[PDB]
Design an enzyme around this catalytic site. Structure first.
Site, short mmCIF file in Angstrom:
data_model
loop_
_atom_site.label_atom_id
_atom_site.label_comp_id
_atom_site.label_asym_id
_atom_site.label_seq_id
_atom_site.Cartn_x
_atom_site.Cartn_y
_atom_site.Cartn_z
CG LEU A 18 -2.12 -1.12 1.15
CD1 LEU A 18 -2.96 -1.02 2.41
CD2 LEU A 18 -3.04 -1.14 -0.08
N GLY A 19 2.14 1.21 0.31
CA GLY A 19 3.03 2.38 0.37
C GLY A 19 4.50 2.00 0.24
N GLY B 115 10.01 3.78 5.80
CA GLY B 115 9.72 2.48 5.16
C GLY B 115 8.31 2.39 4.56
CB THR B 116 7.11 -0.09 2.15
OG1 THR B 116 6.12 -1.11 1.94
CG2 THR B 116 8.51 -0.75 2.29
CG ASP C 108 -4.69 12.54 5.78
OD1 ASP C 108 -5.57 13.13 5.04
OD2 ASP C 108 -3.86 11.75 5.29
#
Lengths: 300, 300
Positions: free
Chosen positions: B43-44, B45-46, B151
């Site tokens: 979905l996206g 360190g990671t 957010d």
């Protein structure tokens, strides 16, 4: 008077002076006669639980290590006599029998591990937190003398009194070892922090065994996959978070003893906030033998 | 007994007591072995979408954040484990591999934004209004712990079940930001209200994109000249009036989460009066993976 020629000659009589300004080690090494102590039980050359009993004057809990390779025994003695800390055990004396013997102090109330098992339901948060401070303070003193303990554990802390504990002399335990120690036999003060972390866990669980019934051979892998000892029921996440940090894989990620002192101090200042124990608001070893007077309290 | 002299000595053994009466943080920090979970998508360190799968016992939607600067990762973990609210996502556990890993829950039915797009024609006023209550309630809980989300958005709310939503963990989105946030990087609970306002709009438009195809660089100016997101066709002016208030330029002009809870509650009590939806009277993510059991429902 002193010509240059005469000055050279006396170089054969007087070594040249080069003062370091280093602090003289004034530690005492007492020699004790064998008759003065009796062995009662065997704990492990070999190690006996016994009493020291000076002629005339008191019976003192001592461990007697009866072990040529005498440069070894005497060098260990040297460092053991040299430590001066309220939370580290000191050498009592030696006995220069053909087999040289080391005499170190044992506390009247035994090892801390046995103590939490016996006193499981009667130990409040104050006692537990303050013990951790003291253990850090002893380990920190050791850091300052650049001594790596290599085997810090609850069995290796002794109860002088309920509010005073001391790390017993250092003289492989996989379940207390750092990952780097297991993998590469590396030992450092930071490896000791991992061991402190485990020992804190033992206290908080009142003497649970770390990694129970898991083979030693498996421990290394479990560590690399990131499993660690579980949160004890009485521990707020604040306390538990400190344990966990001590088990970082990177030794420099772990806290230092000087930091640990400060952290647990703050907690001991407000113990019910960091440990929840229900109802918070002597020993078997003590009754074994038993005057039964601790050494510190007998001497100086 | 205890002379004043002895009392001083023990100050070295027992830290002075100063009870705060503050509530002990009893949150649980679970450590999980790496083998116990698998990563499936990135979905996206990671960050990976993955499942947690306890040995023996169930497959649990989890997000795995794989990120030295470990004081950071552990401190985030601390606060993430500490939240206890029915509408806020909680940390599942961590994994103490050399690269420390954070495991947070994901809901079986995915993010709410995807949900309204998929279920556009089958969502009645009741469902929409009650979701808003729940989002306010989670944000209000965060206000109480003095945490600014920074957010909040429809993509950041997750569907536990059609009638239960949770704000996903906080771990720059111009089109959801307050004017003060864009201009001066100020973030406050009132900046979060603006974001709540936008997210409510997303739900009411069934997943329309805010300010579509307007450059981010222009958003700030459009705001200062007093343009705001348009009234959604299904929204009575009563509902729309709440959104608008959340976008006042003065942060203190905007309503509070405790107020928002009450307002949307009243509407959810009579939903057809405040939202007009024609015909009012699983998901893609759910079918991706898929037991597929949510974490809350597995534990405690």
């Amino acid at each position: 008077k002193r010509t240059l020629r005469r000055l050279l000659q006396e170089r054969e009589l007087v070594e040249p002076l080069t003062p370091s300004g280093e602090a003289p080690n004034q530690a005492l090494l007492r020699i004790l006669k064998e008759t003065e102590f009796k062995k009662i039980k065997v704990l492990g050359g070999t190690v006996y639980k016994g009493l020291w009993i000076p002629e005339g004057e008191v019976k003192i809990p001592v461990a007697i290590m009866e072990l040529k390779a005498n440069k070894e025994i005497l060098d260990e003695a040297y460092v053991m006599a040299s430590v001066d800390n309220p939370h580290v055990c000191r050498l009592l004396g030696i006995c220069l029998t053909s087999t040289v013997q080391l005499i170190t102090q044992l506390m009247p109330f035994g090892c801390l591990l046995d103590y939490v098992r016996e006193h499981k339901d009667n130990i409040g948060s104050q006692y537990l937190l303050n013990w951790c401070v003291q253990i850090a303070k002893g380990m920190n003193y050791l850091e300052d003398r650049r001594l790596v303990h290599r085997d810090l554990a609850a069995r290796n802390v002794l109860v002088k009194t309920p509010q005073h504990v001391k790390i017993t002399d250092f003289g492989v335990p996989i379940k207390w070892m750092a990952l780097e120690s297991i993998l590469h036999r590396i030992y450092t003060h930071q490896s000791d922090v991992w061991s402190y972390g485990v020992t804190v866990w033992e206290l908080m669980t009142f003497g649970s065994k770390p990694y129970d019934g898991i083979p030693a051979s498996e421990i290394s892998s479990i560590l690399e996959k990131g499993e660690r000892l579980p949160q004890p029921p009485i521990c707020t996440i604040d306390v538990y978070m400190i344990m966990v940090k001590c088990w970082m894989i990177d030794a420099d990620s772990r806290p230092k003893f000087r930091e640990l002192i400060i952290e647990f101090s703050k907690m001991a200042r407000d113990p019910q906030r960091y440990l929840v124990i229900q109802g918070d608001e002597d020993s078997n070893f003590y009754r074994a033998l038993m005057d039964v007077v601790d050494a510190d309290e007998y001497l100086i």
